[PDB]
Paper text:
[name] also plays a key-role in the importation of the characteristic plant tumour-derived compounds such as the opines agrocinopines A and B discovered in 1981 in crown gall tumour tissue. The mature [name] structure is a monomer of 493 residues composed of two lobes, each formed by a central β-sheet flanked by α-helices. We identified the pyranose-2-phosphate-like moiety shared by these two ligands as the key recognition template for [name].
L-arabinose relatives and D-glucose-2-phosphate are well defined in the electron density maps. The L-arabinose-2-isopropylphosphate and L-arabinose-2-phosphate alone or within agrocinopine A make the same protein interactions and superimpose well. [name] cannot recognize a phosphate alone, nor a D-glucose, nor a L-arabinose, nor a glucose linked to a phosphate via an oxygen atom other than its O2.
Numbering used by the authors: 32 to 521
The structure:
Amino acid sequence: RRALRLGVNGLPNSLEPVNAISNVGPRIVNQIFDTLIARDFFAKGAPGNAIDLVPALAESWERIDEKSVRFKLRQKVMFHDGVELTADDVAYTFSSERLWGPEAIKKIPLGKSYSLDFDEPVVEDKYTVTLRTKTPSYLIETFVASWMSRIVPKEYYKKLGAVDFGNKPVGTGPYKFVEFVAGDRVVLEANDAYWGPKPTASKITYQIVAEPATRVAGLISGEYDIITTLTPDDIQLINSYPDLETRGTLIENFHMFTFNMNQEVFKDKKLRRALALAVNRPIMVEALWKKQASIPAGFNFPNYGETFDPKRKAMEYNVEEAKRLVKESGYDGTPITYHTMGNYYANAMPALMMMIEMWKQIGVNVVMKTYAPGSFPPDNQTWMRNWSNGQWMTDAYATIVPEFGPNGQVQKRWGWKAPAEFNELCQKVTVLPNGKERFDAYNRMRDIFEEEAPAVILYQPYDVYAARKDVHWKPVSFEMMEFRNNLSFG
Ligand SMILES: O=P(O)(O)O[C@@H]1[C@@H](O)[C@H](O)[C@@H](CO)O[C@@H]1O
């Protein structure tokens, strides 16, 4: 078997699966671990975007009532160290201790905020576990198929602790941990004792190549088999090589910019809204994305299913109103920093430079401030920054509630003083089953989100990879790389 060499935009600071949640962690942690339920992106000849859910670590499951789901586990699955997976490991994964309780916040900072209102799991037998919520939740199934739900080994994880575990992970996945050189590379090797499809690569390397031009040259020189996070501008040249090709797809994520609302200039919604109203998304999508990116109608995406609003109007663009808001605001002309980690996000700097021009036309002076990985300054030294949100559930709950909700980081850390009505609606949508009331509540939340502008949605990126034609692998419609029944050579 051939070793797979990947040229990547960045790496997570931990391989602990919840802590690894980002654009860069899942492509690694998806290899090391498994979930109870998994998504088959290639079902019924779909081009890596199928919504179909299939058994994975759980052979079957059944919803018992409004707050519990019973899982029948696959038997004789082994973790990479030979330990057998049991309901004990699954209960530990979803426990107060490890994940959502007061004692978990120090280890998994976003565990509680991103989790459901969990009750302790119930182990019925070695291969049967019930996952429950304290209050009604119809989101258990989608949560369990998500990146929040990779199953960790209880004894090994408790032995090392979440920090050391993140540096030496043990999972049930098709690839096992070899090395992690902080801010440089991750090496994984084939897990030949895997319960599912046998791994097709002997090894996988994720080498950070921060600069996309250098990443592109690395594939050209034969240093890499697949490279990530390219832009539509790289397409024509890469495809000019008979041996190389680009592979891309729209993904279930949106790029955005957001604010440090603890800062005086951003405490009020006025300048936040003025900056949002001056963002000409069609020109950015045309110029930087070659029309391949998509512009959603608010915090509203098709993967939400029953809570997607297909009749929703496009987000407003109004330069004259934006000019009036700047004039009425307390803004003096003082430069406002916008923190970006080079091109961690595809088109980060070209998108920012276009917006700086749009903002200059409305009377706002925005200045780019570059930071290297691990050098994001203290919160109070930041004003604007770019970010992204992966839409990780088959429901509108994510990411508006975990990120922007009353218990979330945009309010708690970043100082968004959300209107009381917004927080009231977040609590309602959490417990309600699908219906008119829940549907309408999400629309009112979308309306408040656009009015308040705690963040400004740019677009869904067209995720561009490039690969050698002799490396058969298809991208999926999510911020990760799938190799199960999707990697072969020659
Ligand atoms: O944009 P990033 O690469 O920094 O990572 C974000 C997370 O921070 C976020 O938790 C998640 C869900 O909304 O979406 C992304 O994965």
